[PDB]
């Protein structure tokens, strides 16, 4: 009962056969989640709509991925990836912002339990592959305790509401490293022309900042 379900899409697939010819075979995509960082996607195929829903829901509740989250309402850091010609870029975002993402991602985050972020999808639009890459990235993201114990340094967080104050996030469980990181200058990092545009502010488009419905 803790799990809530959601039907992402439904399609009337058709495949032919010798004697009866075209057969209608409902395929459906579904997701399930607690609202506590645990969820799972799944497909279901059957001749009947309700039977397909039931198959998908059952094997979904059986197949589930868990993902961590930073402060119960966001991801740890932005994630950019591609999956079957489906580029997707999610951006962390602080409180009081909401979910301005693809409606599928919005429902999925409602199931997960995170309350706000941003995201963009580019290239092909196949929401099956979209969800698969989404869960892949949300599973491959590294936590801050993980990263701290890996590197050997103290994490330090800084807000805009809070002034120049170092907020430690997580410390290494093992022995801390002695020397600090050398300042990496002019790093070789592949960045995005669109986000550089939007940061430089020259970018203009009526379609960017719309006052949509609640979340």
């Amino acid at each position: 009962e803790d799990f809530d379900t959601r039907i992402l899409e439904v399609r009337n697939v058709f495949t032919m056969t010798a004697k009866e010819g075209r057969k209608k075979s409902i395929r459906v995509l579904v997701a399930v989640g607690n609202g506590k960082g645990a969820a799972g996607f799944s497909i279901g195929k059957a001749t009947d709509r309700m039977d397909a829903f039931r198959k998908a829901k059952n094997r979904a509740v059986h197949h589930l991925h868990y993902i961590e989250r930073y402060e119960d309402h966001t991801i740890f850091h932005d994630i950019s990836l591609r999956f079957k010609r489906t580029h997707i870029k999610m951006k962390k975002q602080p409180k009081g912002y909401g979910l301005r993402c693809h409606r599928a991602i919005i429902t999925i985050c409602r199931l997960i339990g995170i309350k706000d972020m941003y995201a963009k999808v580019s290239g092909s639009i196949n929401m099956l592959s979209l969800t698969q890459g989404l869960f892949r990235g949300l599973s491959r993201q590294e936590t801050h305790q993980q990263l701290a114990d890996k590197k050997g340094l103290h994490v330090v967080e800084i807000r805009e509401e809070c002034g120049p104050l170092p907020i430690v996030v997580a410390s290494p469980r093992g022995p801390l490293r002695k020397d600090p990181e050398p300042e990496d200058e002019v790093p070789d990092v592949k960045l995005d022309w669109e986000d550089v545009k939007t940061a430089q502010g020259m970018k203009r488009s009526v379609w960017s900042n719309l006052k949509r419905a609640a979340t």
């Binding site: 803790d2 506590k36 645990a38 509740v61 197949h63 991925h65 868990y66």
Partner: peptide, 24 residues
Amino acid sequence: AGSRLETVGSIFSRTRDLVRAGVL
């Protein structure tokens, strides 16, 4: 329930974080 997806990571990670979520 238990998670049947093994390409994600280790069985231990999945069992641990599912117990933390409170599914099992």
